[PDB]
Write a protein that binds this ligand. Structure first.
Ligand SMILES: *[C@@H]1O[C@H](CO)[C@@H](O[C@@H]2O[C@H](CO)[C@@H](O)[C@H](O)[C@H]2NC(C)=O)[C@H](O)[C@H]1NC(C)=O
Ligand SMILES: *[C@@H]1O[C@H](CO)[C@@H](O[C@@H]2O[C@H](CO)[C@@H](O)[C@H](O)[C@H]2NC(C)=O)[C@H](O)[C@H]1NC(C)=O
Ligand SMILES: *[C@@H]1O[C@H](CO)[C@@H](O)[C@H](O)[C@H]1NC(C)=O
Ligand SMILES: *[C@@H]1O[C@H](CO)[C@@H](O)[C@H](O)[C@H]1NC(C)=O
Ligand SMILES: *[C@@H]1O[C@H](CO)[C@@H](O)[C@H](O)[C@H]1NC(C)=O
Ligand SMILES: *[C@@H]1O[C@H](CO)[C@@H](O)[C@H](O)[C@H]1NC(C)=O
Ligand SMILES: *[C@@H]1O[C@H](CO)[C@@H](O)[C@H](O)[C@H]1NC(C)=O
Lengths: 254, 99, 120, 162, 49, 50
């Protein structure tokens, strides 16, 4: 089942500053009281991060490129953002990745889904609406896990695809900032490594409607793109990354 | 920065040791920098070549480290000879030499 | 610990012996340097118990009895202000013995002037 | 010492002659496998990570994602066991130089051995800061330095005293 | 300017850093030598007319 | 072939840097001597013979 959403309001997507967000642990190695220089796919400091809104009538589900990797930030309250879609053509011709977080658990499936133009979930005012794909014929990988999840909650995710391995990094942050990304530092812990082995060039954000037509809950998300670069990370005495330096940002940090 | 002269020598020696230890992580054109990985992954006819590449790279690194160690040893020996001269002429007697 | 690597390394000859010999020469040279700089007196001179030097105060350079290291306050400040087959050999002269040599030199130059450097 | 110096007569002094490495007594494999042996120099294989070392109980506070710990030189100094989630330090196995302290062969054939940087319990036994000294008796009297050992310790012949 | 040569040169590690640091040390040593030899006075004196 | 050129040029550069370090040590010794002559012969009268 697919449903076209025809009540959107036309508005260009916004842009804002990344500040010092998007740093994740590059590996599974404990390091204490050290300064470590690593060259990996990172989000540049103070970069131009694209801002999308969900407010009522804004419902931002565009087609975005994946490129080398995607940093996904979410200023979220009341649980509208539910999952992501990854693939190349997003149809039954190629094989695509599904990540969803419904009311019970987190489901990851790698199947040839015939995706809808507007994939979505729904909350009735209980969850009783799911319209993402119309079919699933060839499934190779399945993974059912625990639930991962004024704006009160900050969700950071990093999606990378190297050597057929999909690395998902996650961090949950209590915030009290009203509109934009808070300025500070928080290192993203590695969440899961999936051996999906599929080509990914395009991705989709999955939202949830509110029914009482449809109403969009107040939410905002940010999309940034990873680039191969070097960071200098500082590990404290407790093994937590507390500060970082972008090696190619300015001559002082260089 | 009063004690920079001693700290410079300490930093140089520690940096030379860190570079010499760090050079083991380099494969020098071989498939891996770990000897056990090469010995467990390849047959001895090609593992001999890979081990030879690792040996020549590490030997070049060690010879380089010994070369700068000898040069720094010569510099420290000259400084120590000067210090012994100052101990003999300034502390154990009064020196007429200006400055 | 690779036996095959050592067998291949033996084809290159006595490079390892040369490197070990050079490092050993440097290591003995450091001890020779310390002997040449600090061990220039064969008598361990000591200051008198009464520090009556005609108004001259040497408390900042003489060893402190309260400190276990028997160092001067200046020497204590100096020591506070300085911070895979590799081994570090300890120096032949420890820090307390070097401090003892400096104390002997200070006692000689305070109580005897330059006479102790040229004879009795 | 005669073989190392390539001479049948050895002058008085200390001579570096060999290298002492504590050989791995057992091999331990831990996969998600053999028993876990601590406080001994053993070979270890943790999740495909091979090495040789002594496993001791660790006071580090590894976060759940973190598995093996690296030091300044990027060598694995701590590891988490994949079956029982506990942290173990990996100290490198005891290695050191073996030096032979002897007087002249014209005087005597008695020798003492110094294991540099090696504690005496992993090898006339005397523990010095320079290492473990075997074959030389320690005396409380102080003399001039004849054969330098290190860390203020010297050796002489009068038997060999330290 | 060969990128393949630099990619192969990265396998050898930090040899280039050591060479650059040694040359930098020599270069600052020359300035230190000139400073020690000639700058032994902090007052610029002039002869009388 | 590029590896052969790299190792040859690296050996040449290491040789050049080593001999430059030795000459730098010699020039530093000469400059220390020159500073001693500046202090003792120009800024004062020296009793040292020759
Ligand atoms: C929702 O809208 C999309 C966009 O118009 C529809 O996708 C089109 O589907 C028709 C089916 O005949 C194709 O011919 C078009 O080429 C599609 N357009 C694009 C851009 O893909 C989709 O079918 C609509 N959903 C429903 C249920 O009608
Ligand atoms: C020599 O100098 C020392 C240090 O300058 C003097 O020690 C000080 O004595 C006063 C008065 O007793 C104390 O308040 C200071 O704290 C002391 N300084 C230190 C560092 O302990 C000492 O009195 C002087 N005279 C003699 C004869 O020793
Ligand atoms: C971000 O990009 C938009 C256009 O893509 C541009 O108008 C805006 O000025 C950029 N922001 C910054 C801070 O450069
Ligand atoms: C969430 O998805 C899983 C997988 O299909 C399903 O078994 C479960 O019932 C779903 N929960 C809800 C509340 O729909
Ligand atoms: C994928 O699905 C189609 C139709 O369901 C089928 O014809 C094809 O053989 C499948 N391919 C694989 C590799 O299973
Ligand atoms: C992945 O998809 C993109 C776009 O279709 C294509 O350009 C690229 O060659 C593909 N890569 C692989 C390894 O198939
Ligand atoms: C590290 O943890 C200890 C408690 O184990 C805490 O007291 C200390 O403040 C922590 N350090 C930092 C930098 O947070």
């Amino acid at each position: 089942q697919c449903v076209n959403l025809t009540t959107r309001t036309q508005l260009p997507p916004a842009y804002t500053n990344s500040f010092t967000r998007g740093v994740y642990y590059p590996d599974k190695v404990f390091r204490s009281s050290v300064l470590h220089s690593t060259q990996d796919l990172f989000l540049p400091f103070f970069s131009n991060v694209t801002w999308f809104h969900a407010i009522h009538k804004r419902f931002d589900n565009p087609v975005l490129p994946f490129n080398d990797g995607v940093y996904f930030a979410s200023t979220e309250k009341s649980n509208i953002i539910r999952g992501w879609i990854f693939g190349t053509t997003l149809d039954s011709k190629t094989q695509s990745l599904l990540i969803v977080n419904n009311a019970t658990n987190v489901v990851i499936k790698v199947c040839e889904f015939q995706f809808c133009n507007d994939p979505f979930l729904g909350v009735y005012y209980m969850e009783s609406e799911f319209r993402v794909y119309s079919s699933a014929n060839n499934c190779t990988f399945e993974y059912v896990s625990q639930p991962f999840l004024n704006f009160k909650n900050l969700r950071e995710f990093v999606f990378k695809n190297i050597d057929g391995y999909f690395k998902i990094y996650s961090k949950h942050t209590p915030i009290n900032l009203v509109r934009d990304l808070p300025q500070g530092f928080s290192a993203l812990e590695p969440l899961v490594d999936l051996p999906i082995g599929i080509n990914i060039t395009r991705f989709q954000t999955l939202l949830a409607l509110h029914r009482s037509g449809w109403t969009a809950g107040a939410a905002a998300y940010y999309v940034g793109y990873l680039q191969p670069r070097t960071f200098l990370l500082k590990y404290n005495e407790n093994g937590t990354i507390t500060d970082a330096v972008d090696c190619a940002l300015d001559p002082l940090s260089e | 920065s009063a004690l920079g002269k001693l700290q410079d020598v300490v930093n140089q020696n520690a940096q030379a040791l860190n570079t010499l230890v760090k050079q083991l992580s380099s494969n020098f054109g071989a498939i891996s920098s770990v000897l056990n990985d090469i010995l467990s992954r390849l047959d001895p006819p090609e593992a001999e070549v890979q081990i030879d590449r690792l040996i020549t790279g590490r030997l070049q690194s060690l010879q380089t480290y010994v070369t700068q160690q000898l040069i720094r040893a010569a510099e420290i020996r000259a400084s120590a000879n000067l210090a012994a001269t100052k101990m003999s002429e300034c502390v154990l007697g009064q020196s007429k030499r200006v400055d | 610990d690779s036996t095959e690597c050592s067998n291949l390394l033996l084809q290159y000859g006595s490079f390892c012996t040369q490197l070990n010999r050079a490092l050993t020469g440097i290591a003995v040279e450091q001890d020779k340097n310390t002997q040449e700089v600090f061990a220039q007196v064969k008598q361990i001179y000591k200051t008198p118990p009464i520090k009556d030097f005609g108004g001259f105060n040497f408390s900042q350079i003489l060893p402190d009895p309260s400190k276990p290291s028997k160092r001067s306050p200046i020497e204590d400040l100096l020591f506070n202000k300085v911070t895979n087959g590799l081994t570090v050999l300890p120096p032949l002269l420890t820090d307390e013995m070097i401090a003892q040599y400096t104390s002997a030199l200070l006692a000689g130059t305070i109580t005897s002037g330059w006479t102790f450097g040229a004879g009795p | 010492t005669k073989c190392t110096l390539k001479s049948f007569t050895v002058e008085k002094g200390i001579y570096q002659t060999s290298n002492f490495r504590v050989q791995p007594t057992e091999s331990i494999v831990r996969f998600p496998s053999t028993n876990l042996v601590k406080n001994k120099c053993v070979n270890f294989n943790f999740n495909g990570l091979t090495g040789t070392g002594v496993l001791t109980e660790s006071n580090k506070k590894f976060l759940p994602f973190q598995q093996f710990g690296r030091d300044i030189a990027d060598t694995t100094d701590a590891v988490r066991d994949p079956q029982t989630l506990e942290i173990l330090d990996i100290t490198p196995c005891s290695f050191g130089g073996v030096s032979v302290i002897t007087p002249g062969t014209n005087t005597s054939n008695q020798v003492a051995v110094l294991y540099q940087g090696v504690n005496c319990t992993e090898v006339n036994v005397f523990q010095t800061r320079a290492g473990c000294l075997i074959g030389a008796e320690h005396v409380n009297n102080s003399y001039e330095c004849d054969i330098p050992i290190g860390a203020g310790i010297c050796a002489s012949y009068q038997s060999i005293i330290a």
